[PDB]
Amino acid sequence: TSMLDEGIMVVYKRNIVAHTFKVRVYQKVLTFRRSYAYHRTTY
Amino acid sequence: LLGSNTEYVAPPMWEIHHINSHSQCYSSYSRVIAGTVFVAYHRDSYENK
Numbered sequence A: 001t002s003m004l005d006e007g008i009m010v011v012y013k014r015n016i017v018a019h020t021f022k023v024r025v026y027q028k029v030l031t032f033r034r035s036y037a038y039h040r041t042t043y
Numbered sequence B: 001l002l003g004s005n006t007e008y009v010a011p012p013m014w015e016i017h018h019i020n021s022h023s024q025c026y027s028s029y030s031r032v033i034a035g036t037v038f039v040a041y042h043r044d045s046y047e048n049k
């Protein structure tokens, strides 16, 4: 007593590259130096 | 408007014990450096409430 579909395949990832976008940051920088004064040698 | 030093400091151990047994802190920090002790108060001229 003697005695399989075929096709075309496209595979896809889950994508992991996190989304970039630029951001504008507005801010001010106040700096306070302080000094002493005697003769000609500022401390 | 002028400067703004801000330093972060560990309480004294007697105060640690107060904090976590009463849920409250004293309105004064004191640390000795070199000779004398220094001390800060919350609003100016305040007491040790």
Ligand SMILES: *[C@@H]1O[C@H](CO)[C@@H](O)[C@H](O)[C@H]1NC(C)=O
Residues within 6 Å of the ligand: B026, B028, B030, B039, B048
């Ligand atoms: C504040 O009170 C605590 C205990 O009541 C005391 O140990 C501390 O030295 C006081 N701080 C002062 C008087 O600056």
